[PDB]
Design an enzyme around this catalytic site. Structure first.
Site, PDB file in Angstrom:
ATOM      1  N   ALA C  15       0.844  -1.206   0.000  1.00  0.00           N
ATOM      2  CA  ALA C  15       0.000   0.000   0.000  1.00  0.00           C
ATOM      3  C   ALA C  15       0.880   1.257   0.000  1.00  0.00           C
ATOM      4  O   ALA C  15       0.459   2.317  -0.433  1.00  0.00           O
ATOM      5  CB  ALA C  15      -0.866   0.113   1.237  1.00  0.00           C
ATOM      6  N   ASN C  89       8.974  -5.883   1.028  1.00  0.00           N
ATOM      7  CA  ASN C  89       9.148  -4.450   0.995  1.00  0.00           C
ATOM      8  C   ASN C  89       8.667  -3.716   2.273  1.00  0.00           C
ATOM      9  O   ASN C  89       8.313  -2.541   2.283  1.00  0.00           O
ATOM     10  CB  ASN C  89       8.399  -4.029  -0.238  1.00  0.00           C
ATOM     11  CG  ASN C  89       8.387  -2.538  -0.485  1.00  0.00           C
ATOM     12  OD1 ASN C  89       9.404  -1.935  -0.760  1.00  0.00           O
ATOM     13  ND2 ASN C  89       7.281  -1.846  -0.309  1.00  0.00           N
ATOM     14  N   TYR C 157      17.947   1.165  12.418  1.00  0.00           N
ATOM     15  CA  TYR C 157      17.670   1.082  10.974  1.00  0.00           C
ATOM     16  C   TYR C 157      18.903   0.596  10.135  1.00  0.00           C
ATOM     17  O   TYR C 157      18.778  -0.250   9.252  1.00  0.00           O
ATOM     18  CB  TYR C 157      17.184   2.471  10.486  1.00  0.00           C
ATOM     19  CG  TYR C 157      16.661   2.439   9.043  1.00  0.00           C
ATOM     20  CD1 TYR C 157      15.366   1.966   8.846  1.00  0.00           C
ATOM     21  CD2 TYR C 157      17.453   2.811   7.935  1.00  0.00           C
ATOM     22  CE1 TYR C 157      14.834   1.846   7.576  1.00  0.00           C
ATOM     23  CE2 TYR C 157      16.935   2.686   6.646  1.00  0.00           C
ATOM     24  CZ  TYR C 157      15.626   2.209   6.486  1.00  0.00           C
ATOM     25  OH  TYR C 157      15.045   2.116   5.252  1.00  0.00           O
TER      26      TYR C 157
HETATM   27  N1  NAJ Z   1      11.701   5.697   0.723  1.00  0.00           N
HETATM   28  C1  NAJ Z   1      13.016   5.819   0.884  1.00  0.00           C
HETATM   29  O1  NAJ Z   1      13.624   6.869   0.663  1.00  0.00           O
HETATM   30  C2  NAJ Z   1      13.765   4.562   1.362  1.00  0.00           C
HETATM   31  C3  NAJ Z   1      15.126   4.431   1.082  1.00  0.00           C
HETATM   32  C4  NAJ Z   1      15.747   3.184   1.161  1.00  0.00           C
HETATM   33  C5  NAJ Z   1      15.023   2.055   1.540  1.00  0.00           C
HETATM   34  N2  NAJ Z   1      13.662   2.164   1.885  1.00  0.00           N
HETATM   35  C6  NAJ Z   1      12.879   0.953   2.252  1.00  0.00           C
HETATM   36  O2  NAJ Z   1      11.887   0.658   1.246  1.00  0.00           O
HETATM   37  C7  NAJ Z   1      10.785  -0.082   1.825  1.00  0.00           C
HETATM   38  C8  NAJ Z   1       9.444   0.559   1.454  1.00  0.00           C
HETATM   39  O3  NAJ Z   1       9.343   1.866   2.049  1.00  0.00           O
HETATM   40  P1  NAJ Z   1       8.509   3.104   1.426  1.00  0.00           P
HETATM   41  O4  NAJ Z   1       7.652   2.597   0.332  1.00  0.00           O
HETATM   42  O5  NAJ Z   1       9.370   4.286   1.171  1.00  0.00           O
HETATM   43  O6  NAJ Z   1       7.616   3.473   2.724  1.00  0.00           O
HETATM   44  P2  NAJ Z   1       6.077   3.357   3.175  1.00  0.00           P
HETATM   45  O7  NAJ Z   1       5.293   4.307   2.361  1.00  0.00           O
HETATM   46  O8  NAJ Z   1       6.115   3.516   4.644  1.00  0.00           O
HETATM   47  O9  NAJ Z   1       5.685   1.836   2.782  1.00  0.00           O
HETATM   48  C9  NAJ Z   1       6.067   0.701   3.588  1.00  0.00           C
HETATM   49  C10 NAJ Z   1       4.795  -0.029   4.004  1.00  0.00           C
HETATM   50  O10 NAJ Z   1       5.067  -0.976   5.053  1.00  0.00           O
HETATM   51  C11 NAJ Z   1       3.827  -1.100   5.773  1.00  0.00           C
HETATM   52  N3  NAJ Z   1       3.945  -1.765   7.080  1.00  0.00           N
HETATM   53  C12 NAJ Z   1       4.525  -1.318   8.206  1.00  0.00           C
HETATM   54  N4  NAJ Z   1       4.542  -2.279   9.135  1.00  0.00           N
HETATM   55  C13 NAJ Z   1       3.948  -3.302   8.540  1.00  0.00           C
HETATM   56  C14 NAJ Z   1       3.705  -4.531   9.105  1.00  0.00           C
HETATM   57  N5  NAJ Z   1       4.191  -4.835  10.301  1.00  0.00           N
HETATM   58  N6  NAJ Z   1       3.041  -5.423   8.337  1.00  0.00           N
HETATM   59  C15 NAJ Z   1       2.645  -5.142   7.095  1.00  0.00           C
HETATM   60  N7  NAJ Z   1       2.887  -3.956   6.563  1.00  0.00           N
HETATM   61  C16 NAJ Z   1       3.541  -3.016   7.266  1.00  0.00           C
HETATM   62  C17 NAJ Z   1       3.319   0.302   5.921  1.00  0.00           C
HETATM   63  O11 NAJ Z   1       1.907   0.326   6.152  1.00  0.00           O
HETATM   64  C18 NAJ Z   1       3.734   0.911   4.581  1.00  0.00           C
HETATM   65  O12 NAJ Z   1       2.618   1.043   3.695  1.00  0.00           O
HETATM   66  C19 NAJ Z   1      11.100  -0.115   3.307  1.00  0.00           C
HETATM   67  O13 NAJ Z   1      11.783  -1.332   3.613  1.00  0.00           O
HETATM   68  C20 NAJ Z   1      12.040   1.061   3.501  1.00  0.00           C
HETATM   69  O14 NAJ Z   1      12.799   0.892   4.683  1.00  0.00           O
HETATM   70  C21 NAJ Z   1      13.054   3.436   1.792  1.00  0.00           C
HETATM   71  C1  MAX Z   2      21.198   9.081   2.050  1.00  0.00           C
HETATM   72  O1  MAX Z   2      20.634   8.030   2.819  1.00  0.00           O
HETATM   73  C2  MAX Z   2      19.279   7.913   3.011  1.00  0.00           C
HETATM   74  C3  MAX Z   2      18.591   8.848   3.701  1.00  0.00           C
HETATM   75  C4  MAX Z   2      17.249   8.960   3.616  1.00  0.00           C
HETATM   76  C5  MAX Z   2      16.498   9.958   4.469  1.00  0.00           C
HETATM   77  C6  MAX Z   2      15.780   9.309   5.683  1.00  0.00           C
HETATM   78  C7  MAX Z   2      14.557   8.384   5.588  1.00  0.00           C
HETATM   79  O2  MAX Z   2      15.079   7.036   5.724  1.00  0.00           O
HETATM   80  C8  MAX Z   2      16.309   7.059   6.312  1.00  0.00           C
HETATM   81  O3  MAX Z   2      16.829   6.064   6.769  1.00  0.00           O
HETATM   82  C9  MAX Z   2      16.738   8.480   6.558  1.00  0.00           C
HETATM   83  C10 MAX Z   2      16.983   9.360   7.826  1.00  0.00           C
HETATM   84  C11 MAX Z   2      16.184   8.955   9.045  1.00  0.00           C
HETATM   85  C12 MAX Z   2      15.431   9.852   9.707  1.00  0.00           C
HETATM   86  C13 MAX Z   2      14.754   9.475  10.804  1.00  0.00           C
HETATM   87  C14 MAX Z   2      14.811   8.209  11.260  1.00  0.00           C
HETATM   88  O4  MAX Z   2      13.848   7.801  12.136  1.00  0.00           O
HETATM   89  C15 MAX Z   2      15.563   7.294  10.607  1.00  0.00           C
HETATM   90  O5  MAX Z   2      15.984   6.194  11.308  1.00  0.00           O
HETATM   91  C16 MAX Z   2      15.336   4.946  11.154  1.00  0.00           C
HETATM   92  C17 MAX Z   2      16.235   7.687   9.504  1.00  0.00           C
HETATM   93  C18 MAX Z   2      16.584   8.118   2.806  1.00  0.00           C
HETATM   94  C19 MAX Z   2      17.256   7.182   2.115  1.00  0.00           C
HETATM   95  C20 MAX Z   2      18.590   7.062   2.212  1.00  0.00           C
HETATM   96  O6  MAX Z   2      19.014   5.779   2.024  1.00  0.00           O
END
Ligand code: NAJ
Ligand code: MAX
Ligand code: NAJ
Ligand code: NAJ
Ligand code: NAJ
Ligand code: MAX
Ligand code: MAX
Ligand code: MAX
Lengths: 267, 267, 267, 267
Positions: C15, C89, C157
């Site tokens: 989602a 994811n 994290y």
């Molecule tokens: N967005 C970024 O900049 C960034 C960078 C690098 C890696 N990631 C990773 O990419 C993945 C997806 O993140 P996103 O799409 O940016 O964020 P997001 O929009 O928070 O999507 C992640 C989803 O996980 C869902 N969720 C949380 N807990 C649970 C649970 N226990 N059971 C089922 N669903 C759950 C939550 O509802 C959300 O919709 C995550 O593993 C991040 O840590 C994000």
């Molecule tokens: C350039 O690197 C990264 C930094 C970012 C910015 C933040 C969102 O996810 C992260 O891990 C970053 C910083 C952040 C802020 C608050 C927190 O709660 C957190 O800890 C879990 C992390 C995203 C992806 C990258 O990969």
């Protein structure tokens, strides 16, 4: 004899194989050591073996309990007036089978708990009394499973020794600004302590097989060699290294020999 | 004073900043040292500085000449009866601009020659007198450019310090079977020797900026700290490590801080 | 339009930002998708947005509950007769401050739970219906925090995204023998979804700063680009890659620019 | 059929096994291709095989000659009006034995020349016509020898495939600022082309042994799978990845199985 003259160290997991050799070697180098462990009487026989209560003492500490890590550290400040070195050397193996299908969910939780949160808690309380002194070395024992896999090393142990390198790299980036170095040591099979759980496991015998399979011949990896790597990182002579995962595998992980042995010649 | 009691070492590039501090520190630890270099008189003032001809001597050696590496090694066997340690510490920078467009083709060839083939030749002749003794440590100086990039570090220097790690990993897998350890050390900016080629470059001043930009505060990286890392790898106490690229950057390369500084708060 | 013709996929965290773009792109390529999430109504608006119930449906699944992962998978086998692709994811951030001193112990447990055990559970049940078909691709989203640190990214994290790479490498070594590929994708900042928790955080604005700080100019990293990396790994065209941590940072993590910006010239 | 609609590519080493499958696959995807090579007639039979002169043509180019790389690129701009993709796929093996002792000094020079300077020259001239268009993807073929060792892979080939990753990481940090992505692909044994130099070498047979020794079962690595990895990196769908060493070994390099096979059970 005095290379670590001054120093006050805490060895978490210090009643065990790498922990006792390390403590023995930090005492031989002039330091005051606190071995911390849940193995009561073995922790006491280790300490009262090595030297007197003035240099080594034993504290019970279950490193998944924050009240116990709080107490282990505060008892080292009350005994010796400071904290120079923290060696977070607790690690446990998995007690369910290797296949992901038979790998336990409770077991995953608990190995994650001892191995990663237990290391987070140790760094948390050491950073409490090291940041105001603006000096310190935190050394974690990771494993070569902090960056490779192995058939037969459970998926929670690989995942936990990668997360220990994860905290090493992360704590290093936070704490180098307070002059605190954070490192880890990644050993291959360390030789013993005379093993049976299954049969096969006997520990004149595991180093014999670790030599079969070893890059680097003519030496056996023993706890004394990891001890030397964390004594380097802990004191003396390593005061601009904080990046480091110090692999001590004689080069085992630098090659996968399966297609070279399938290569050969003479038939 | 005698941690390296026994030892016979060759320091390639040993008239330079990391090479002289290292040789000074191997003499303080009980070893016989041969500094090898093309800088004649500086190599002679370094040696005749440190101790007498009985412990350190200078040999001219242009490590891109195999007849000279043959001679440097055979002269160490004829003087001292053996070879325990080889530290291949020659490296040069690029003398054309950073952009790939203005980076020279001749310059590429020559930096590749000094930095990689020069290291191949050193390991080739050291492995000649170490394999029959079935003991030995070959240490190369690589750089943090053995795994990262930097704006302003030329593309041939990055490519050459990756290939030095390449020979480290490769020689390690061949030679651990004769009980010979192969390692490299990857330093960040080592402080001096009072610099002008352009202006800016002055060397109280480069460590001042290396501290601005440093992970790890309160310490300056100096040649003495790389020296301590190769003394560890060279002797004493590192006899089951052969995997290693021993990064000595205080954690600089564990983070890219550009998006955190773009983070901040208070406006 | 049909590159993934055949395929049955589960998007855990589907989602969310990376999860919905990915599902949108697997439907555009001919697959049947099951988005799984705890965000009920957002998961339902995402699905009923993209296509009809015949291709995408929503299942509630809290991936730290094994009964729910059991149900998510068994409901995909009952709907579509098989499992080709699992994209794990789910990831959460920390809700305590960055300093190790103020980083929460409960928060550590819970982020470890969602991010690592939640990924273990997903691979556990997908491997249940993929090993008998002896075909499959499990893709995890890790992060560039699976191998670096950052000031401001919490220590739990970093430690959790290293342990996700740890399970990727470990599951890869177990499951490649049943013809199952295990990979992860490590994105830099993915652009949105219009952010306030603190102020500053607004999400036309985070990509603007991610461009300030970016290696690679002229492109913004958006969820569509991670989607393309996991569509590659998931099907089509990647059937001999299983090693991989597929970094998608435009080269951000290949340099630390702090000492180059301290370099400069013109004053 | 048209995923790479637009594109103008140069395949260096394009008469060979990975180079011809790649060119075949870039033509199937809508691109105009220039195969470049020293193997004259094989380069001509490859081109005139695939399609007409309007889409693929052959140019002689000895990539250690800058006048020839200048000509290869300027002839692609004169034919097709631009340069989108450069795939630097030349690599040679060593023709002296593996042991450092018997490894040739001339051979070292020449393998260094073809494999690294040859790649520097290709990136140099491609960056000439890509920087003003401020668009581009340079893909290098490295190897799993860009980060591991193997008994039997010569020390100059390891050192050269590490230096190719070195230029990949370095060019990536320079050129991402002009919107140009730089990547490399690191394959395990790619299946053929029906081999004898020694005997043993026959090439239904090398993939049979590459499967013995493989992580990942049930698939053979063939040139078509590297082709798919560089088609991903080259166009379509990879426009925020520039970090990457895209390993395509089915997970071979994620484990060293020597101590697990020394583990076993049943005797
Ligand atoms: N967005 C970024 O900049 C960034 C960078 C690098 C890696 N990631 C990773 O990419 C993945 C997806 O993140 P996103 O799409 O940016 O964020 P997001 O929009 O928070 O999507 C992640 C989803 O996980 C869902 N969720 C949380 N807990 C649970 C649970 N226990 N059971 C089922 N669903 C759950 C939550 O509802 C959300 O919709 C995550 O593993 C991040 O840590 C994000
Ligand atoms: C350039 O690197 C990264 C930094 C970012 C910015 C933040 C969102 O996810 C992260 O891990 C970053 C910083 C952040 C802020 C608050 C927190 O709660 C957190 O800890 C879990 C992390 C995203 C992806 C990258 O990969
Ligand atoms: N020995 C090897 O071959 C090997 C290889 C690589 C890494 N390691 C790691 O090295 C470290 C030390 O292991 P070792 O010395 O071989 O094993 P060991 O002999 O089991 O010693 C580890 C000690 O940890 C102690 N312990 C367990 N749980 C707790 C707890 N919750 N609180 C406090 N103490 C506890 C335990 O009593 C033991 O004495 C561990 O992190 C291992 O995972 C071991
Ligand atoms: N100093 C740093 O900040 C830095 C950082 C990281 C790595 N390194 C490496 O560390 C090593 C030592 O450098 P340094 O001590 O700073 O510099 P330096 O003071 O230039 O010493 C290197 C020595 O190599 C010598 N030399 C050059 N060519 C030859 C040759 N062909 N044959 C024999 N000798 C030769 C030269 O005369 C010099 O004394 C080199 O490999 C560097 O690339 C330096
Ligand atoms: N095939 C494998 O198992 C393997 C594994 C990993 C990496 N690689 C690399 O993949 C790349 C392609 O190799 P391949 O297709 O297997 O081998 P190949 O069939 O030998 O093709 C490489 C081509 O390079 C050509 N060539 C050689 N020297 C020059 C030169 N100086 N100028 C112009 N062309 C030249 C040569 O004619 C040949 O057609 C090389 O970089 C290899 O080192 C191969
Ligand atoms: C060559 O690599 C390693 C293998 C070994 C042998 C085992 C002990 O620790 C391990 O992780 C290995 C295998 C094993 C057996 C049972 C388990 O319960 C377990 O999972 C946690 C692991 C030791 C160190 C190495 O680093
Ligand atoms: C923070 O990283 C590094 C940067 C520096 C500063 C320079 C000296 O050595 C280098 O490689 C750096 C920059 C530079 C300038 C001119 C050149 O000619 C050159 O190319 C070969 C390199 C030193 C060590 C580090 O490891
Ligand atoms: C499993 O690893 C590898 C091994 C192989 C088998 C050989 C061909 O290319 C190599 O590098 C391998 C061995 C070899 C033989 C003779 C040599 O001349 C040579 O040195 C340059 C190398 C191929 C790809 C892999 O990546």
């Amino acid at each position: 004899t005095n290379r670590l003259q001054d120093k006050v160290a805490i060895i978490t997991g210090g009643a065990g194989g790498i922990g006792e050799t390390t403590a023995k070697l930090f005492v031989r180098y002039g330091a005051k050591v606190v071995i911390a462990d849940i193995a009561d009487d073995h922790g006491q026989k280790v300490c009262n073996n090595i030297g007197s209560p003035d240099v080594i003492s034993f504290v019970h500490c279950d490193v998944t309990k924050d009240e116990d890590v709080r107490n282990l550290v505060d008892t080292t400040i009350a005994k010796h007036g400071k904290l120079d070195i923290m060696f977070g050397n607790v690690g446990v193996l998995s007690t369910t089978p290797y296949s992901i299908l038979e790998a336990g969910n409770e077991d995953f939780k608990r190995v994650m708990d001892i191995n990663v949160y237990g290391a987070f808690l140790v760094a948390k309380h050491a950073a409490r009394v090291m940041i105001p002194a603006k000096k310190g070395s935190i050394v974690f024992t990771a494993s070569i499973s902090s960056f490779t896999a192995g058939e037969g090393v459970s998926h929670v142990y690989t995942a936990t020794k990668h997360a220990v390198l994860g905290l090493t790299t992360s704590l290093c980036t936070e704490l180098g600004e307070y002059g605190i170095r954070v490192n880890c040591v990644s050993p291959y099979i360390v030789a013993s302590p005379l093993l049976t759980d299954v049969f096969g496991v006997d520990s004149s015998r595991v180093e014999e097989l670790a030599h079969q399979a070893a890059n680097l011949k003519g030496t056996l990896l023993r706890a004394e060699d990891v001890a030397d790597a964390v004594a380097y990182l802990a004191g003396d002579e390593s005061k601009y290294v904080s990046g480091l995962n110090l692999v001590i595998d004689g080069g085992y992980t630098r090659t996968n020999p399966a297609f070279p042995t399938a290569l050969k010649h003479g038939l």
